[PDB]
Scaffold this active site. Structure first.
Site, PDB file in Angstrom:
ATOM      1  N   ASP A  77       6.786   3.805   1.810  1.00 31.24           N
ATOM      2  CA  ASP A  77       5.722   3.767   0.814  1.00 31.24           C
ATOM      3  C   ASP A  77       5.850   5.008  -0.054  1.00 31.24           C
ATOM      4  O   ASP A  77       6.371   6.041   0.380  1.00 31.24           O
ATOM      5  CB  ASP A  77       4.352   3.705   1.500  1.00 31.24           C
ATOM      6  CG  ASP A  77       3.223   3.283   0.558  1.00 31.24           C
ATOM      7  OD1 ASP A  77       3.459   3.089  -0.659  1.00 31.24           O
ATOM      8  OD2 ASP A  77       2.075   3.163   1.045  1.00 31.24           O
ATOM      9  N   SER A  78       5.383   4.898  -1.292  1.00 28.89           N
ATOM     10  CA  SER A  78       5.727   5.870  -2.320  1.00 28.89           C
ATOM     11  C   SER A  78       4.715   6.998  -2.458  1.00 28.89           C
ATOM     12  O   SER A  78       5.002   7.979  -3.156  1.00 28.89           O
ATOM     13  CB  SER A  78       5.886   5.151  -3.652  1.00 28.89           C
ATOM     14  OG  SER A  78       4.748   4.353  -3.902  1.00 28.89           O
ATOM     15  N   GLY A  79       3.556   6.896  -1.810  1.00 25.45           N
ATOM     16  CA  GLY A  79       2.596   7.979  -1.750  1.00 25.45           C
ATOM     17  C   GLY A  79       1.305   7.714  -2.489  1.00 25.45           C
ATOM     18  O   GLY A  79       0.351   8.475  -2.315  1.00 25.45           O
ATOM     19  N   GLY A  80       1.236   6.655  -3.297  1.00 29.50           N
ATOM     20  CA  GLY A  80       0.038   6.421  -4.090  1.00 29.50           C
ATOM     21  C   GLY A  80      -1.187   6.103  -3.253  1.00 29.50           C
ATOM     22  O   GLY A  80      -2.276   6.628  -3.506  1.00 29.50           O
ATOM     23  N   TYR A  81      -1.030   5.246  -2.243  1.00 29.36           N
ATOM     24  CA  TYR A  81      -2.177   4.811  -1.453  1.00 29.36           C
ATOM     25  C   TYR A  81      -2.677   5.918  -0.534  1.00 29.36           C
ATOM     26  O   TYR A  81      -3.886   6.048  -0.314  1.00 29.36           O
ATOM     27  CB  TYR A  81      -1.803   3.564  -0.646  1.00 29.36           C
ATOM     28  CG  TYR A  81      -2.820   3.154   0.397  1.00 29.36           C
ATOM     29  CD1 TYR A  81      -3.962   2.443   0.045  1.00 29.36           C
ATOM     30  CD2 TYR A  81      -2.628   3.460   1.740  1.00 29.36           C
ATOM     31  CE1 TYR A  81      -4.888   2.058   1.003  1.00 29.36           C
ATOM     32  CE2 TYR A  81      -3.548   3.082   2.704  1.00 29.36           C
ATOM     33  CZ  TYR A  81      -4.675   2.382   2.330  1.00 29.36           C
ATOM     34  OH  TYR A  81      -5.589   2.008   3.289  1.00 29.36           O
ATOM     35  N   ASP A  99       2.805   4.373  -7.921  1.00 27.51           N
ATOM     36  CA  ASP A  99       1.776   3.783  -8.765  1.00 27.51           C
ATOM     37  C   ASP A  99       0.451   4.498  -8.532  1.00 27.51           C
ATOM     38  O   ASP A  99       0.360   5.450  -7.751  1.00 27.51           O
ATOM     39  CB  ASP A  99       1.661   2.273  -8.524  1.00 27.51           C
ATOM     40  CG  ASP A  99       1.191   1.931  -7.123  1.00 27.51           C
ATOM     41  OD1 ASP A  99       1.177   2.814  -6.238  1.00 27.51           O
ATOM     42  OD2 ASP A  99       0.841   0.754  -6.903  1.00 27.51           O
ATOM     43  N   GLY A 150      -3.099  -3.534  -3.670  1.00 30.79           N
ATOM     44  CA  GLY A 150      -4.516  -3.657  -3.939  1.00 30.79           C
ATOM     45  C   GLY A 150      -5.274  -4.605  -3.037  1.00 30.79           C
ATOM     46  O   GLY A 150      -6.416  -4.957  -3.357  1.00 30.79           O
ATOM     47  N   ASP A 172       3.350  -4.975   6.851  1.00 30.99           N
ATOM     48  CA  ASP A 172       3.241  -3.712   7.582  1.00 30.99           C
ATOM     49  C   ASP A 172       1.770  -3.458   7.896  1.00 30.99           C
ATOM     50  O   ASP A 172       0.909  -3.735   7.066  1.00 30.99           O
ATOM     51  CB  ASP A 172       3.832  -2.537   6.773  1.00 30.99           C
ATOM     52  CG  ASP A 172       2.848  -1.964   5.771  1.00 30.99           C
ATOM     53  OD1 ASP A 172       2.030  -1.092   6.164  1.00 30.99           O
ATOM     54  OD2 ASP A 172       2.877  -2.392   4.597  1.00 30.99           O
ATOM     55  N   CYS A 195       3.950 -13.933  26.964  1.00 34.81           N
ATOM     56  CA  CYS A 195       4.705 -12.868  26.327  1.00 34.81           C
ATOM     57  C   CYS A 195       5.975 -12.546  27.098  1.00 34.81           C
ATOM     58  O   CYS A 195       5.974 -12.467  28.327  1.00 34.81           O
ATOM     59  CB  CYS A 195       3.841 -11.613  26.249  1.00 34.81           C
ATOM     60  SG  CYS A 195       4.601 -10.261  25.352  1.00 34.81           S
ATOM     61  N   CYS A 217       7.673  -9.659  26.667  1.00 38.08           N
ATOM     62  CA  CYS A 217       8.007  -8.245  26.567  1.00 38.08           C
ATOM     63  C   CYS A 217       8.125  -7.612  27.952  1.00 38.08           C
ATOM     64  O   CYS A 217       7.662  -8.164  28.960  1.00 38.08           O
ATOM     65  CB  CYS A 217       6.977  -7.488  25.729  1.00 38.08           C
ATOM     66  SG  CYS A 217       5.539  -6.860  26.605  1.00 38.08           S
ATOM     67  N   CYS A 256       4.866  -7.115  30.002  1.00 36.11           N
ATOM     68  CA  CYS A 256       4.296  -8.266  30.685  1.00 36.11           C
ATOM     69  C   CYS A 256       5.196  -8.786  31.793  1.00 36.11           C
ATOM     70  O   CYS A 256       4.748  -9.612  32.605  1.00 36.11           O
ATOM     71  CB  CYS A 256       3.997  -9.365  29.675  1.00 36.11           C
ATOM     72  SG  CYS A 256       2.742  -8.883  28.442  1.00 36.11           S
ATOM     73  N   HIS A 260       3.699  -3.623  24.119  1.00 33.18           N
ATOM     74  CA  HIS A 260       3.316  -5.023  24.179  1.00 33.18           C
ATOM     75  C   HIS A 260       2.838  -5.534  22.824  1.00 33.18           C
ATOM     76  O   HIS A 260       3.183  -6.650  22.408  1.00 33.18           O
ATOM     77  CB  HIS A 260       2.225  -5.268  25.216  1.00 33.18           C
ATOM     78  CG  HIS A 260       1.551  -6.582  25.004  1.00 33.18           C
ATOM     79  ND1 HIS A 260       2.125  -7.781  25.376  1.00 33.18           N
ATOM     80  CD2 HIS A 260       0.409  -6.894  24.344  1.00 33.18           C
ATOM     81  CE1 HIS A 260       1.339  -8.772  24.982  1.00 33.18           C
ATOM     82  NE2 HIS A 260       0.297  -8.259  24.349  1.00 33.18           N
TER      83      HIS A 260
HETATM   84  C1  LIG Z   1      -4.066  -0.946   5.062  1.00 36.24           C
HETATM   85  N1  LIG Z   1      -4.268  -1.310   3.672  1.00 36.24           N
HETATM   86  C2  LIG Z   1      -3.430  -0.970   2.694  1.00 36.24           C
HETATM   87  N2  LIG Z   1      -3.652  -1.330   1.411  1.00 36.24           N
HETATM   88  C3  LIG Z   1      -2.605  -0.817   0.668  1.00 36.24           C
HETATM   89  C4  LIG Z   1      -2.306  -0.845  -0.685  1.00 36.24           C
HETATM   90  C5  LIG Z   1      -1.153  -0.198  -1.124  1.00 36.24           C
HETATM   91  C6  LIG Z   1      -0.853  -0.132  -2.586  1.00 36.24           C
HETATM   92  O1  LIG Z   1      -1.498  -0.785  -3.402  1.00 36.24           O
HETATM   93  N3  LIG Z   1       0.138   0.688  -2.945  1.00 36.24           N
HETATM   94  N4  LIG Z   1       0.541   0.840  -4.288  1.00 36.24           N
HETATM   95  C7  LIG Z   1      -0.313   0.436  -0.205  1.00 36.24           C
HETATM   96  C8  LIG Z   1      -0.616   0.459   1.146  1.00 36.24           C
HETATM   97  C9  LIG Z   1      -1.782  -0.165   1.585  1.00 36.24           C
HETATM   98  N5  LIG Z   1      -2.327  -0.268   2.866  1.00 36.24           N
HETATM   99 ZN   LIG Z   2       3.793  -8.430  26.503  1.00 40.88          ZN
END
Ligand SMILES: CNc1nc2cc(C(=O)NN)ccc2[nH]1
Ligand SMILES: [Zn+2]
Ligand SMILES: CNc1nc2cc(C(=O)NN)ccc2[nH]1
Ligand SMILES: [Zn+2]
Lengths: 368, 368
Positions: free
Chosen positions: B92-96, B141, B215, B265, B303, B305, B308, B334
């Site tokens: 991830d790029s750091g904006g959030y 962003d 978003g 993610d 499961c 794993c 379990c 798990h």
């Molecule tokens: C857990 N919720 C959640 N919402 C996100 C939104 C963004 C986003 O709009 N990045 N430009 C990134 C990570 C996020 N993680």
């Molecule tokens: Zn398991």
């Protein structure tokens, strides 16, 4: 597979090396037992404990009787099944943790939880260890705080020897225990040579599978501990294992083996590992120190453990500084593996008739 | 091995299944990325992450630039070498995280650490991700808090699209990055269909290897998220992967795949695992509940794993109640394995033309 068979394969001075064969596996001596007080060796899966070389681990009567409870563990199949460790387990009998963490009489002791009220006695301690399914059962005794008076020591020792007899009888009165498990007695007497002798004679009169040296690793200093070991271990039966409870730092273990000890347990590699202390052949290091922030070398340059094969000091530095669980996992696995490699080096050097040289070489480099 | 090659092997409605081939490995889609924000997936060794089935993990520009620092990680050989994960990493790029944990302009943003002052911009974010050695780089962003006004959304989206152009140019101006890594753009526009369309057109005008839906997962509700996905995903290029950031609960993932999402993610399986929540095909359970104190069954009856296969609910109950690290390790392994088995079931059902039935069957049992 025998219930309990101790063989000495080689000697050098007072040091010995050999094996203990038990139903659930072989224990190479001198042995170090990782501590698994709450039915886990902290931050390690049992498979990882075994990978480091451990043959046997230690559990605790006092802790497990409180949580999750000994009757419960028995109902769920025993401690081995519960935690997933299928090899031998030694259980401390509860005397030292009653004094350390938690109303005494000749019958036993009542105490408050670390908080409900609970009771322990020689017969109750042996029954809890049966419920847990321990392979090496410890006799229940009465510890007295350090630095105990000469009278506080003789009174606690004499009672402990009477309690050693009741532990023997309670163990022997349980057929599944007496046929599949072993029983160790605990020498007391503080730093007093005559009391240590009286304890040794009483325990040898009763007869045990092994003999522990109690009342050390209580803040007495290594010089005093070594002094007490010098005369105390030769009082124990030569043909049975000798277990030094609660010891210790690497140099403590080496000196203790030089004085005839075969078995060891200590929380130091696990506890101080989580705190950021890593053991190396050049002495301990605090991985949190800023000097390690960009150090790409492993924790120790010779260590064979999986941590030193894969990850750098700089990464483990970062993990411990961020409070990451993986930092505790990696530090703990390395430290327990370092302890096991130390015991392996001790076993090999005694068997080869060069343990004195190894001890000298070890201390020269470790304390440089 | 190609830099980035996305193939769709089968479809059902809007759902797709296929692969992304990259230099460091193949990514099966729909894919779930475990989150490794501080250069570790919390409480798991990388080998354990891989064992659960993960093809790719997520790291964080905002966190790693603070600790231990991006220049430092580059000096120590890159993020892959640093943490011991040799497969693809998306960053991830750091904006959030700037908006969530930590003075904005058209140039970029200055902020205070979670506490020194720091700076981020499209060019600075791309350079940090080069320093880290990320395989999938995210465009930088400007996120706006939820529930944003219609004006706070259009202004943040328009700027983000200008920042998407500068991210493209900064990435393309770095030869080692452009030849060995991939770049994703992030669709914004909140819940507004016209703004989502304007964002999609701008990003497709620039051209990216993949397109994320930003978003969402901000406290909007699943019905609103599903509503936004219904029109937003068809605006993205069909032939490129679609990444829904921050999602989510199992039922969120299934509904999102039904609407055309390929990548996911979320911290939920790791974070809630440490808190005692275990995912099962009959819905989540809190392993701390007293009902599990003597339950010998595994966490989930189906499961596959390693947790379990070996340990009971009653043991994991005890561990989490005692605050033991092994409890967090086992719960986390798990949960991440459950998530990966869920994605595998999704991939198999789409490829077999029975994903609609699987989704219906999944929800019927999970919400029973
Ligand atoms: C857990 N919720 C959640 N919402 C996100 C939104 C963004 C986003 O709009 N990045 N430009 C990134 C990570 C996020 N993680
Ligand atoms: Zn398991
Ligand atoms: C860490 N020190 C330490 N000293 C101990 C003494 C005993 C004892 O005398 N039991 N009867 C047991 C465990 C000990 N652990
Ligand atoms: Zn090591």
């Amino acid at each position: 597979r025998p219930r309990f068979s101790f063989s000495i394969a080689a000697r050098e001075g007072k040091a010995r090396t050999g094996t203990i064969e038990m139903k659930r596996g072989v224990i190479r001596t001198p042995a170090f037992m990782p501590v698994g007080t709450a039915a886990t060796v902290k931050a390690l899966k049992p498979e990882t404990v075994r990978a480091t070389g451990a043959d046997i681990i230690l559990g605790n009567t006092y802790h497990l009787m409180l949580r999750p409870g000994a009757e419960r563990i028995a109902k769920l199949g025993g401690l081995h099944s519960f935690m997933g460790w299928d090899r031998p387990i030694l259980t401390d009998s509860g005397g030292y943790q009653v004094m350390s963490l938690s109303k005494q009489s000749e019958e036993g002791v009542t105490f408050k939880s670390h908080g409900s009220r609970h009771m322990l006695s020689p017969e109750r301690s042996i029954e809890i260890q049966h419920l847990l399914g321990s392979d090496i059962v410890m006799a229940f005794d009465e510890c007295t705080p350090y630095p105990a008076t000469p009278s506080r020591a003789a009174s606690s020792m004499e009672r402990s020897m009477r309690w050693a007899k009741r532990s023997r009888d309670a163990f022997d009165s349980r057929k599944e225990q007496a046929e599949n498990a072993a029983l160790f007695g605990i020498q007391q007497g503080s730093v007093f040579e005559n009391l240590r002798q009286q304890s040794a004679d009483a325990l040898a009169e009763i007869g045990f599978d092994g003999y522990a040296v109690g009342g050390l690793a209580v803040g007495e200093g290594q010089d005093e501990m070594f002094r007490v070991l010098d005369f105390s271990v030769p009082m124990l039966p030569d043909d049975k294992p000798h277990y030094l409870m609660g010891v210790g730092k690497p140099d403590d273990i080496v000196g203790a083996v030089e004085r005839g000890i075969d078995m060891f347990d200590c929380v130091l590699p696990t506890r101080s590992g989580r705190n950021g202390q890593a053991f190396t052949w050049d002495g301990p290091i605090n991985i949190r120190n800023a000097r390690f922030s960009e150090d790409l070398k492993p924790l120790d340059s010779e260590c064979h453990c999986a941590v030193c094969q894969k990850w750098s000091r700089a990464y483990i530095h970062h993990l411990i500084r961020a409070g990451e669980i993986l930092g505790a996992m990696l530090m703990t696995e390395h430290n327990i593996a370092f302890y096991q490699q130390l015991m392996q080096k001790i076993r090999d050097s005694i068997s080869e008739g060069r343990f004195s040289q190894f001890a000298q070489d070890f201390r020269a480099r470790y304390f440089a």
